[PDB]
Design a protein around this motif. Structure first.
Motif, PDB file in Angstrom:
ATOM      1  N   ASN A   1      76.832   7.818  -8.313  1.00 38.16           N
ATOM      2  CA  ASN A   1      78.141   7.154  -8.458  1.00 38.16           C
ATOM      3  C   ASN A   1      78.041   5.723  -8.945  1.00 38.16           C
ATOM      4  OD1 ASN A   1      76.898   4.975  -6.833  1.00 38.16           O
ATOM      5  ND2 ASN A   1      77.344   5.863  -4.730  1.00 38.16           N
ATOM      6  N   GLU A   2      76.887   5.324  -9.530  1.00 38.19           N
ATOM      7  CA  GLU A   2      76.720   4.195 -10.315  1.00 38.19           C
ATOM      8  C   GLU A   2      76.949   4.475 -11.926  1.00 38.19           C
ATOM      9  OE1 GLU A   2      74.048   1.257  -9.475  1.00 38.19           O
ATOM     10  OE2 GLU A   2      73.907   1.668  -7.324  1.00 38.19           O
ATOM     11  N   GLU A   3      77.203   5.820 -12.218  1.00 41.11           N
ATOM     12  CA  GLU A   3      77.358   6.338 -13.433  1.00 41.11           C
ATOM     13  C   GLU A   3      78.554   5.528 -14.209  1.00 41.11           C
ATOM     14  OE1 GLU A   3      77.266  10.789 -13.683  1.00 41.11           O
ATOM     15  OE2 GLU A   3      75.163  10.145 -13.055  1.00 41.11           O
ATOM     16  N   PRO A   4      78.648   5.419 -15.610  1.00 40.54           N
ATOM     17  CA  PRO A   4      79.700   4.909 -16.371  1.00 40.54           C
ATOM     18  C   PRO A   4      80.898   5.359 -15.682  1.00 40.54           C
ATOM     19  CG  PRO A   4      77.916   5.507 -17.901  1.00 40.54           C
ATOM     20  CD  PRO A   4      77.505   5.845 -16.644  1.00 40.54           C
ATOM     21  N   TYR A   5      81.092   6.709 -15.495  1.00 39.55           N
ATOM     22  CA  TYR A   5      82.383   7.113 -14.896  1.00 39.55           C
ATOM     23  C   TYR A   5      82.474   7.193 -13.523  1.00 39.55           C
ATOM     24  N   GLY A   6      81.261   6.476 -12.905  1.00 39.64           N
ATOM     25  CA  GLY A   6      81.148   6.516 -11.523  1.00 39.64           C
ATOM     26  C   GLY A   6      81.761   5.242 -10.780  1.00 39.64           C
TER      27      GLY A   6
ATOM     28  N   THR B   1      96.256  10.739 -12.052  1.00 40.79           N
ATOM     29  CA  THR B   1      96.215   9.469 -11.476  1.00 40.79           C
ATOM     30  C   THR B   1      96.606   9.532  -9.909  1.00 40.79           C
ATOM     31  OG1 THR B   1      96.010   8.328 -13.385  1.00 40.79           O
ATOM     32  CG2 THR B   1      96.675   7.046 -11.552  1.00 40.79           C
ATOM     33  N   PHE B   2      97.870  10.365  -9.798  1.00 42.13           N
ATOM     34  CA  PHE B   2      98.336  10.622  -8.257  1.00 42.13           C
ATOM     35  C   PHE B   2      97.596  11.627  -7.550  1.00 42.13           C
ATOM     36  CE2 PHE B   2     103.067   9.668  -9.630  1.00 42.13           C
ATOM     37  CZ  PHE B   2     102.982   8.577  -9.122  1.00 42.13           C
ATOM     38  N   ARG B   3      96.799  12.477  -8.381  1.00 41.70           N
ATOM     39  CA  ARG B   3      96.208  13.524  -7.595  1.00 41.70           C
ATOM     40  C   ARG B   3      94.916  13.108  -6.982  1.00 41.70           C
ATOM     41  NH1 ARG B   3      95.404  19.425 -10.136  1.00 41.70           N
ATOM     42  NH2 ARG B   3      97.059  20.395  -8.720  1.00 41.70           N
ATOM     43  N   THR B   4      94.127  12.336  -8.088  1.00 39.09           N
ATOM     44  CA  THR B   4      92.638  11.940  -7.583  1.00 39.09           C
ATOM     45  C   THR B   4      92.558  10.444  -6.943  1.00 39.09           C
ATOM     46  OG1 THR B   4      92.091  11.069  -9.932  1.00 39.09           O
ATOM     47  CG2 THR B   4      92.114  13.330  -9.250  1.00 39.09           C
ATOM     48  N   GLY B   5      93.977   9.777  -7.192  1.00 43.61           N
ATOM     49  CA  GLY B   5      93.897   8.506  -6.521  1.00 43.61           C
ATOM     50  C   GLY B   5      92.773   7.395  -7.262  1.00 43.61           C
ATOM     51  N   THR B   6      92.416   7.876  -8.514  1.00 37.44           N
ATOM     52  CA  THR B   6      91.484   7.017  -9.350  1.00 37.44           C
ATOM     53  C   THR B   6      91.955   6.861 -10.845  1.00 37.44           C
ATOM     54  OG1 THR B   6      89.073   6.723  -9.806  1.00 37.44           O
ATOM     55  CG2 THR B   6      90.077   8.926  -9.918  1.00 37.44           C
ATOM     56  N   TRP B   7      91.035   6.034 -11.584  1.00 37.29           N
ATOM     57  CA  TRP B   7      91.343   5.722 -12.918  1.00 37.29           C
ATOM     58  C   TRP B   7      90.858   6.575 -13.916  1.00 37.29           C
ATOM     59  CZ3 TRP B   7      95.561   2.959 -13.016  1.00 37.29           C
ATOM     60  CH2 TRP B   7      95.696   1.964 -12.004  1.00 37.29           C
ATOM     61  N   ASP B   8      90.133   7.540 -13.502  1.00 42.69           N
ATOM     62  CA  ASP B   8      89.180   8.395 -14.209  1.00 42.69           C
ATOM     63  C   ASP B   8      89.901   9.011 -15.706  1.00 42.69           C
ATOM     64  OD1 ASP B   8      86.993   8.130 -12.505  1.00 42.69           O
ATOM     65  OD2 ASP B   8      87.761   9.595 -11.487  1.00 42.69           O
ATOM     66  N   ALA B   9      91.398   9.399 -15.385  1.00 44.96           N
ATOM     67  CA  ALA B   9      91.636  10.029 -16.635  1.00 44.96           C
ATOM     68  C   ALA B   9      92.053   8.709 -17.533  1.00 44.96           C
ATOM     69  CB  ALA B   9      93.291  10.356 -16.291  1.00 44.96           C
ATOM     70  N   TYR B  10      92.005   7.458 -17.455  1.00 47.55           N
ATOM     71  CA  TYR B  10      92.004   6.386 -18.364  1.00 47.55           C
ATOM     72  C   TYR B  10      90.818   5.804 -18.686  1.00 47.55           C
ATOM     73  CZ  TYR B  10      96.789   6.520 -17.234  1.00 47.55           C
ATOM     74  OH  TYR B  10      98.495   6.830 -16.699  1.00 47.55           O
ATOM     75  N   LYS B  11      89.814   6.314 -18.337  1.00 53.52           N
ATOM     76  CA  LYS B  11      88.516   6.140 -18.582  1.00 53.52           C
ATOM     77  C   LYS B  11      87.748   7.120 -19.501  1.00 53.52           C
ATOM     78  N   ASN B  12      87.352   6.876 -20.675  1.00 50.87           N
ATOM     79  CA  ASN B  12      86.659   7.951 -21.594  1.00 50.87           C
ATOM     80  C   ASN B  12      87.713   9.217 -21.737  1.00 50.87           C
ATOM     81  OD1 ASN B  12      83.725   7.796 -22.956  1.00 50.87           O
ATOM     82  ND2 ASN B  12      83.926   6.418 -20.709  1.00 50.87           N
TER      83      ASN B  12
END
Length: 485
Positions: A55-60, A226-237
């Motif tokens: 969970n502390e990974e760069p995408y973490g 961003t709707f589905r996963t409630g996170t910013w992961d799609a705008y990271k990397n």
């Protein structure tokens, strides 16, 4: 629940790690990383291990550097839209062919460039001649964000949904009202009901079907998730579409698994281990319940090795003062193992900082003078081959050692294994047993990983039989071996 009966030496080290924590000697976070890497220590303060929580990974989720981003909440809407709309200082046409400027600012739907240009002077307050500055575009940007926020709260159909959304989803809805405007988004009436009821996998299909999305899918799919996963992961990397999102720790451990089976022994032993340390980065929630302390974090646990420097460091010296043939030949044999490793696990990041060298009639084998340690393997095991091999190459290919043909010694070690399908099968089962423990595991994702790997072995097998060099090996066109089902 940390136990390793197969490796009682590894387990013993882990027990020293835990015990040292109990005595309040905590693993300290390396700043010379850019993620959640820690130096595990024993009760005597010596460094026995390197630990990298999932969970502390760069995408973490819990990476300290990107936590600040998560604080902002909706306020990331500025950056969010900056990425999607980019920045242009002169009038251009958007995807639909409409005149646009600055950051996603629509001037007019008219075909006339001076309509846009007139409308532009109104906004800025002067005669722009179709060219504005960075700050002027920024000033337009805020107002357009305000206008969106206003558009949502002023609307009867839109507002209820918005209030029920968490800070992150709210930002996604604004994103839409930024692109399509108030009235346009309100024709989605189906999905707004659903979104409001919290069903994510429900709405994500219906948003896939719209007049929208079809026009700008690359962007649209970025919001849907961003709707589905409630996170910013799609705008990271969103350039590492080659690798799985947050499984680096498994890569790390997996690399060591492979090494074990191939009997390379360049990879310091790495396994999946759970640890709790006050020094880690925990949610505020978790922190409070500790007052029954901190929960264990899942991570990669890699043994620490001494006496090694960066590969770059030694080769620099070896170039000025060349090793004697026999010593230099020990390097080359170590190098091949590295080449075999990286190719098999298809490492996407290996530099001269990512592997280490150490340079110092009987019942016992004389010690080797030179020895190679392969660290930092969490960027391997891609879902597929990189689109441009130049972006994610094998760096060591440009080293002179890669020109030298594979030694018979390595062929004798590795060919009997990788030519045996029951070895490769067993190897794939072991990886499966490792990867499946991850909550976010996906059987379909796995198959693609295996496919690349099965294709790499395919290439390596024939490379070894033909006695090709490492350099000629990577020039072989990349393949995948895919199961039909």
């Amino acid at each position: 629940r940390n136990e390793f009966p197969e490796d009682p030496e590894f387990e013993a080290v882990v027990r020293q790690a835990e015990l040292a924590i109990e005595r309040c000697i905590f693993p300290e976070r390396i700043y010379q990383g850019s993620s959640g890497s820690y130096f595990v220590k024993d009760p005597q303060g010596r460094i026995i291990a390197v630990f990298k929580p999932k969970n502390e990974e760069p995408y973490g989720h819990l990476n300290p550097k990107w936590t600040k981003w998560l604080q902002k909440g909706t306020g990331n809407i500025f950056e969010m839209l900056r990425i999607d709309e980019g920045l242009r200082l002169k009038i251009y046409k958007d995807t639909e062919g409409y005149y646009t400027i600055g950051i996603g600012h629509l001037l007019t739907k008219s075909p006339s460039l001076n309509a846009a240009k007139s409308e532009l002077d109104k906004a800025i307050g002067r005669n722009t001649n179709g060219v504005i500055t960075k700050d002027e575009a920024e000033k337009l940007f805020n107002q357009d964000v305000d206008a969106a926020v206003r558009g949502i709260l002023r609307n009867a159909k839109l507002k209820p949904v918005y209030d029920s959304l968490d800070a992150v989803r709210r930002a996604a809805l604004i994103n839409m009202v930024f692109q399509m405007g108030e009235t346009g988004v309100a024709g989605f009436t189906n999905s707004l009901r659903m979104l409001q009821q919290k069903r994510w996998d429900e709405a994500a299909v219906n948003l896939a079907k719209s007049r929208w999305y079809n026009q700008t899918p690359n962007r649209a799919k970025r919001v849907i998730t961003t709707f589905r996963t409630g996170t910013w992961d799609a705008y990271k990397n969103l350039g590492r579409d080659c690798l799985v999102l947050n499984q680096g720790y498994l890569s790390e451990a997996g690399a060591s698994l492979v090494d074990q089976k191939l009997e390379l022994n360049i990879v310091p032993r790495t396994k999946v281990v759970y640890l709790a340390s006050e020094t880690f980065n925990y949610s505020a929630i978790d922190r409070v319940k500790s007052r029954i302390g901190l929960p264990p974090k899942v991570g990669s646990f890699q043994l620490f090795v001494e006496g090694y420097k960066d590969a770059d460091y030694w080769l620099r010296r070896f170039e000025a003062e060349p090793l004697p043939e026999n010593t230099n030949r020990q390097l080359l044999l170590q190098f091949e193992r590295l080449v075999v490793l990286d190719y098999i696990i298809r490492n996407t990041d290996r530099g001269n900082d990512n592997w280490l060298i150490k340079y110092d009639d009987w019942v016992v084998v004389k010690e080797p003078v030179i020895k190679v340690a392969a660290i930092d393997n969490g960027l391997a095991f891609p879902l597929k081959h990189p689109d441009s091999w130049r972006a994610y190459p094998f760096y060591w290919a440009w080293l002179p050692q890669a020109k030298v043909p594979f030694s018979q010694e390595i062929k004798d070690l590795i060919l009997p294994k990788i030519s045996d399908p029951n070895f490769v099968k067993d190897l794939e089962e072991d990886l499966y047993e490792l990867f499946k423990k991850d909550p976010g595991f996906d059987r379909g994702q796995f198959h693609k990983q295996i496919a690349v790997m099965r294709g790499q072995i395919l290439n390596l097998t024939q490379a070894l039989k033909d006695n090709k060099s490492p350099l000629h090996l990577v020039q072989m066109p990349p393949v995948i071996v895919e199961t039909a089902r």
